Write a protein that binds this DNA or RNA. Structure first.
Ligand SMILES: Nc1ccn([C@H]2C[C@H](O)[C@@H](COP(=O)(O)OP(=O)(O)OP(=O)(O)O)O2)c(=O)n1
Ligand SMILES: [Mg+2]
Ligand SMILES: [Zn+2]
Lengths: 208, 118, 179, 873
DNA sequence: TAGTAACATAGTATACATAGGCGCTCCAGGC
């Protein structure tokens, strides 16, 4: 979302929860990466668990959510005593931490551990001083703007059984950007004024 | 309490005697193996040596870079519990940058906490 | 010569590219997001010509730069990627050779899956996510309709090296130790 | 936000695994600008757990289990909780205070009245074990109480009622699909203000059609219909017409193209029907329409069993967007489908209440089968035509067939709505929920244990007690204790006059009379001792009194004359429902898995019932009167007279003499029989005398327990038995009766041999207790064999609770009669099948007639066999 | 370090089932 930050599982577990935001002291973390050894893995019908270890604290559990239909990477479970790099975001549940695995990669060059530890120390120092410095009625409320009104009228006017697509919408309206088209379409679909017919790019009004 | 449940600091051959009765990981350049197989010698890349002993003689042929997990004994020797051989088929490993990494880590241990720090 | 190693936070703080000439610097980062929409377009098949051709709904495409009509076209890679490092993130745009190096497959190869195997195309995009490289980026600031928008152009991507990178990191941490 | 905020809640929901300590409320709110009601959602946070710690009298060390001779106090308990438990189980913030409570339940070694320690803390902290023990405390209560129950019993909310919120807030982001949202900080601000009339709701009734494709073995949706009413009153009469708007949508499954000029025909007929391209378009249109209409009650047939699961599965497979619009809560991960008994389906439609007519029909009335055709035939008086699944594909050739299919679907939806309005389900459900206090969607779901549990919970909470904590954790089983008593009958035929006497609400009156309650009766199979007759009424007697007094007013309304028959039927159904609720409240005391299990409490009631029946029988026999029958609360008297006024006077005298003794118990005349035919226990037939006065009275047939009311005999045998028993009770000479019976039997035999009877009068109906695949001995079970064949052949996926019909065919394979059962469609379609006449003449008519005619001289089994011509020798 | 386009940029796991009582006949099949 914003920036990945290398860290260590010791810092991960020592982090605290404040208003859905995990802070290790005065350091905010949302996505993290860690490099370590897998000691034991357990196979679930859908998920796969791993026992990562960075020799800084007790071994940690990492959960990788894989769909059992895609029999591509689950059959390639990494054998033990292998050093791998894990990128993902952590999760908290009943005062025991957990890790969600966005990506798992076996490590080929083995100077990467020292590079990773240097990243950890340097980033921790830099961002710790970066936070260390100071100065851091109930109505339905309806109403549509003119742009959304034009979009709705354009959607309504078409006689095609499958409805309009994005190309025609962009062609007819040259007075506003594509992003405005996307926002108006999203809002109209959320309010139920339009619905998709076949694909996500086809739309049609519901009243007609 | 098995050793894999406790923190193991990375200590080179420089400060072997300062971590007595403490878990420790060591890595480096294999030099010589005793014919018995219970113990061997290791190089830290700085010209210094460190000896490792095992309760049972080693059964497999070892070579290349190796790391050992153990504890410093009264004789400043390492009682190994596990070891892993490091790959050298593709990329060389430069131990000097590793050593300076240990020096830097010891320089600022606060940002690399050992154990659970409250 | 030597790459002007600069964190993106420093790049946005000093206002790189606000001068009359663009500024050049390179950095290592990891890809966090890519856009698969509008990524493919038809370029002019004439040699050393890359103007976007216009379909005439007849199987023959006429190029305005060469004023010439051809029955075939060549695919050309255009991509927008979200680069991100430990501190900040940036939006960059690639070209044929750089995106082809990043993805690892030539454009004509991709010309088949988008027509016959969408799943394989999605898989190819997927397996290249969360990779780290060294990108040379040139920054310049152009104004369009009275707002200044910073744009990033990348002309070279390379695999990450560890020796000199580690030496530079050690040098920087030593330097910050005094400060 | 402006001071107060009034709204009327309908449904509640909570999630203790993702958003602990929050409770959602959905309902209606009045808007002055538009002069209408709109949907609203209010979400409540900060619900704290409550624990009660029981101090000891002497300090016992755990390791040794001995007393150290040290007195105890509240300070010691506080110190032990703070120092040991809080640090061990990671509890940071808490509030503690001593209180007084009363306990009168199963847990032993607890004083009736004592001082407890009340501890409250936020729900996000871990949960203590259910069996905690300490140095100074011996027990704890309320460790695993849910948040919804805590909120409901703390705020004294009893069903739907008007609520007010003090100092609301505004959410940063939308959560629900409601028009207006609100936020409450603490459950202290919510107050009950119910003193006014409820607002109207919006009702939607719907039904769809399905077809099975040959290539892909899945069920597709090809047509839908829906009817909407906008101002459905909740407490008044059902509006007429019951619908105000409607819509229909049709689509082609995957390949077949619509017949040519279909759109032109639709325009010509000016029908508001929407054509779609693929299934995804239909699903999207349906979701958009339900979101736009915003219904509050969705009514359909077999919703929970088949329709909802198919709809959700097709939504998942077709990858349609915005599946959560079917409910009211924004969710993206759909719950696991099928799962346990209706858990996933109920969770999928959160915020919207589902009304299935099948469950309501099962609860309220009694039928031989519960498919839509039978319900239409019985509740209404109309015929519904059934379209086989096979022909559906063929109807895709001409536009007229498609229009007929759409009209049939619309008619099906209209029939469902008419049945729901006729049965008067919504007012009854609302009244029951307001009486009990649970969530009324669960009331619509069914079941009798939850209502009683919630009623007792409310009654005990209101009276400053402590309730037991929740337990962690097919066919009728073996009996556990003695039940009622049935007197020895006096078999035969009676002609002079029969009188019937009966008690009113025997078991509630027993409970109210003898002051039987959890608190009062002291429990150490042995029947306990009666309570001391100087105490006060317990909670159970008062609740039973309220429930039994709620019925006398309905009976008084019934007694009024000049009423339309439908209103009489509705009142009768309501009174029967109230009686069943009271009886269920009694019977829950014997449920093994119940929260208030207590066996002696019911054994005492049954023992007193038997004793009272004995005493009444002896007292009646003392007056030189002959007693012939009685069934655990009633007495039959043979007056041996003809004058009616004498019988009335004798009954009045007996009633006056009996009522003179007891305090609350009462007796009454339940009927006067002109002639009675008694066969066995709980098996008789009689003519009930209805006094119309004015010098005349009308006699009506009545049967009890015979093989004429059972659902597992063929219609031919039932008709023959009804005719014979009608002839027997008539006033004629015996010889004429014998001759008429013989002539009727000879005609029946000749007609059956000739094969002139319709096919329909041969079916046998049975029901399945379990799933068809769970019977190891399917070889000899016909209603399992036919069910398995139906399941394996096509669709409709017959399951537990359904009814299966079958007939016996002649396959020419010299097998037993029980292994040659076939469905009626198989008999009609296949050519090598015919109705087995000998089996039907030997095992269906002969036993019934023989059993009915047993106590009549001149007719015997061998004569019956000879009359049918069934090879006499 | 020409040539490229158009104009801002995205959340996803899970975990938790309900069900009033007993008394008195019927049938199918093997022993
Ligand atoms: N579904 C039922 C019906 C009856 N009973 C038991 C409890 C009753 O006390 C007893 C007598 O039932 P009656 O049918 O004779 O009904 P009541 O005497 O309670 O009421 P009413 O005055 O309507 O006859 O049978 C029961 O447990 N469950
Ligand atoms: Mg009764
Ligand atoms: Zn050109």
């Amino acid at each position: 979302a914003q920036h990945i930050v290398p860290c260590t599982i010791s810092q991960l577990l020592s982090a605290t929860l404040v208003d859905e935001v995990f802070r290790i002291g005065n350091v905010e973390i949302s996505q993290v990466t860690i490099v370590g050894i897998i000691r034991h893995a357990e196979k679930a019908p859908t998920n796969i668990v791993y026992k990562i270890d960075d020799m800084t604290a007790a071994p940690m559990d990492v959960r990788q959510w894989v769909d059992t239909d895609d029999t591509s990477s689950e059959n390639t479970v990494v054998p033990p005593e292998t050093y791998v790099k894990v990128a993902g975001h952590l999760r908290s549940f009943q005062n025991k931490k957990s890790l969600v695995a966005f990506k798992i990669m076996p490590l080929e060059d083995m100077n990467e551990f020292t590079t990773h530890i240097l990243e950890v120390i340097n980033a921790h120092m830099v961002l710790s001083k970066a936070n260390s410095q100071p100065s851091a009625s109930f109505m339905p409320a309806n109403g549509l703007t003119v742009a959304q009104n034009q979009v709705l009228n354009l959607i309504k006017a078409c006689p095609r059984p499958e409805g309009l697509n994005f190309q025609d919408l962009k062609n007819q309206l040259k007075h506003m950007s594509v992003s405005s088209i996307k926002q108006a379409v999203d809002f109209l679909s959320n309010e139920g004024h339009i619905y998709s017919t076949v694909d996500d790019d086809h739309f049609k009004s519901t009243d007609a | 309490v098995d050793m894999m449940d406790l923190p193991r600091s990375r200590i080179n051959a420089g400060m072997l005697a300062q971590f007595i009765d403490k878990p420790v990981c060591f890595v480096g350049r294999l030099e010589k193996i005793h014919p018995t197989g219970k113990m061997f010698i290791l190089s830290d890349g700085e010209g210094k040596n460190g000896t490792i002993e095992l309760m049972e003689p080693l059964d497999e042929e070892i070579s290349g870079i190796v790391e050992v997990v153990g504890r410093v004994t009264a004789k400043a020797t390492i009682l190994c519990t596990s070891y892993v051989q490091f790959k050298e088929d593709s990329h060389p490993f430069d131990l000097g940058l590793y050593n300076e990494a240990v020096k830097i880590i010891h320089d600022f241990p606060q940002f690399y906490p050992l154990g659970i720090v409250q | 010569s030597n790459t002007n190693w600069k964190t993106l936070y420093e790049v946005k703080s000093e206002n790189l590219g606000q001068g009359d000439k663009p500024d050049y610097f390179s950095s290592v980062a990891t890809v966090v997001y890519l856009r698969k929409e509008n990524c493919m377009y038809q370029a002019c098949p004439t040699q050393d010509c890359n103007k976007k051709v216009i379909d005439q709904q007849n199987g023959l495409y006429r190029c305005e730069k060469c004023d010439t009509e051809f029955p075939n076209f060549k695919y050309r890679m255009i991509l927008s990627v979200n680069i991100a490092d430990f501190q900040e993130n940036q939006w960059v745009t690639c070209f044929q050779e750089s995106a082809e190096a990043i993805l690892g497959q030539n454009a004509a190869y991709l010309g088949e899956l988008k027509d016959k195997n969408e799943q394989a195309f999605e898989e190819v995009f997927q397996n290249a996510n969360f990779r780290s490289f060294i990108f040379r980026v040139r920054v310049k600031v152009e104004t369009y309709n009275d707002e200044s928008r910073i744009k990033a152009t990348v002309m070279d991507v390379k695999p990450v090296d560890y020796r000199e990178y580690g030496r530079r990191l050690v040098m920087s941490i030593r330097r910050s130790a005094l400060m | 936000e402006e001071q107060v905020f009034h709204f009327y809640w309908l449904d509640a929901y909570e999630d203790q695994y993702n958003q602990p300590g929050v409770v959602f409320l959905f309902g209606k709110v009045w808007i002055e600008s538009a002069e209408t009601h709109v949907s609203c959602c209010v979400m409540v946070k900060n619900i704290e757990r409550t624990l009660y710690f029981l101090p000891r009298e002497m300090k016992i060390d755990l390791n040794t289990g001995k007393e150290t001779g040290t007195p105890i106090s509240m300070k010691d308990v506080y110190e032990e909780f703070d120092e040991k438990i809080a640090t061990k189980y990671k509890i940071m913030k808490f509030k503690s205070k001593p209180v007084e409570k009363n306990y009168a339940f199963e847990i032993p070694d607890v004083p009736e009245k004592s001082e407890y320690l009340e501890v409250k803390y936020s729900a996000e902290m871990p949960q203590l074990p259910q069996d905690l023990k300490g140095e100074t405390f011996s027990h704890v209560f309320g460790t695993n109480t849910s948040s919804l129950e805590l909120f409901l019993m703390n705020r004294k909310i009893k069903g739907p009622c008007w609520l007010e919120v003090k100092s609301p807030q505004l959410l940063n982001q939308p959560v629900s699909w409601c028009k207006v949202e609100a936020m409450a900080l603490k459950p202290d601000l919510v107050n009950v203000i119910k003193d006014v009339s409820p607002p109207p709701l919006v009702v939607m009734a719907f039904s769809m059609k399905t077809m099975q494709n040959a290539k892909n073995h899945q069920n597709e949706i090809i047509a839908m219909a829906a009817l909407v009413h906008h101002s459905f009153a909740l407490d008044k009469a059902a509006p007429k017409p019951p619908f105000q708007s409607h819509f229909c949508v049709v689509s082609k499954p995957k390949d077949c193209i619509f017949p040519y000029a279909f759109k032109e025909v639709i325009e010509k007929k000016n029908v508001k029907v929407e054509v779609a391209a693929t299934e995804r378009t239909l699903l999207g249109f349906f979701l958009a329409k339900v979101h736009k209409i915003d219904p509050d009650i969705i009514v359909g047939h077999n919703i929970y069993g088949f329709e909802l699961e198919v709809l959700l599965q097709r939504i998942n497979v077709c990858k349609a967007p915005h599946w959560s619009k079917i409910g009211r809560l924004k969710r993206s991960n759909m719950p696991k489908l099928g799962g346990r008994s209706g858990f996933g389906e109920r969770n999928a439609t959160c915020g919207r209440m589902i009304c299935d007519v099948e469950i309501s029909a099962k609860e309220l009335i009694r039928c031989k089968s519960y498919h839509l055709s039978e319900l239409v035939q019985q509740i209404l008086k109309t015929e519904r035509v059934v379209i086989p699944m096979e022909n559906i594909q063929n109807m895709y050739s001409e536009s007229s067939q498609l229009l007929y299919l759409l009209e049939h679907t619309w008619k099906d939806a209209k029939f469902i709505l008419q049945i729901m309005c006729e049965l008067n389900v919504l007012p009854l459900a609302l009244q029951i929920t307001n009486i009990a206090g649970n969530i009324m969607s669960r009331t619509l779901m069914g079941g009798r244990s939850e209502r009683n549990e919630f009623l007792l919970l409310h009654a005990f909470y209101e009276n400053n007690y402590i309730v037991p904590d929740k337990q962690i954790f097919k066919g009728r089983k073996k009996a556990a204790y003695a039940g009622g008593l049935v007197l020895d009958p006096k078999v035969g035929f009676y002609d002079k006059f029969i009188l019937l006497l009966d008690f009113n609400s025997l078991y509630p009156s027993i409970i109210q009379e003898f002051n039987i309650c959890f608190t009062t009766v002291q429990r150490v199979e042995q029947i306990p001792e009666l309570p001391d007759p100087s105490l006060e009424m317990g909670i159970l007697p008062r609740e039973i009194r309220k429930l039994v007094e709620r019925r006398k007013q309905v009976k008084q309304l019934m007694k009024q004359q000049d009423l339309n028959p439908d209103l009489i039927l509705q009142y009768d159904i309501r009174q029967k429902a109230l009686k069943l609720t009271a009886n269920s409240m009694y019977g829950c005391l014997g449920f093994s898995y119940s929260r208030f299990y207590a066996k002696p409490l019911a054994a005492l009631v049954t023992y007193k019932g038997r004793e009272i029946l004995m005493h009444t029988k002896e007292m009646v026999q003392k007056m030189n009167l002959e007693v012939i029958y009685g069934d655990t609360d009633s007495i039959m008297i043979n007056t041996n007279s003809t004058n009616l006024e004498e019988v009335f006077k004798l009954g009045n005298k007996v009633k006056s003499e009996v009522n003179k003794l007891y305090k609350l118990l009462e007796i009454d005349i339940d009927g006067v029989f002109k002639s009675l035919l008694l066969l066995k226990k709980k098996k008789y037939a009689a003519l009930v005398v209805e006094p119309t006065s004015d010098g005349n009275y009308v006699t009506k047939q009545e049967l009890k327990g015979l093989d004429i009311v059972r659902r597992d005999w063929c219609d031919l045998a039932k008709d023959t038995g009804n005719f014979v028993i009608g002839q027997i009770l008539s006033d004629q000479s015996r010889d004429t009766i014998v001759e008429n019976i013989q002539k009727r039997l000879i005609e029946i035999g000749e007609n059956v041999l000739n094969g002139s009877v319709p096919v329909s009068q041969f079916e046998i109906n049975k029901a399945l207790t379990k799933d068809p695949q769970d019977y190891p001995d399917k070889k000899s079970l016909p209603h399992v064999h036919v069910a398995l064949w139906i399941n394996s052949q096509g669709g409709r996926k017959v399951k537990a609770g359904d009814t299966v019909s079958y007939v016996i065919c002649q396959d020419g394979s010299n097998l037993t009669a029980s292994q040659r059962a076939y469905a009626p469609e198989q008999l009609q379609k296949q050519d090598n099948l015919t109705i087995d006449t000998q089996y039907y003449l030997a095992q269906q008519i002969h036993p019934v007639v023989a059993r009915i005619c047993e106590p009549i001289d001149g007719i015997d089994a061998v004569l019956i066999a000879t009359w049918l011509g069934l090879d006499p020798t």
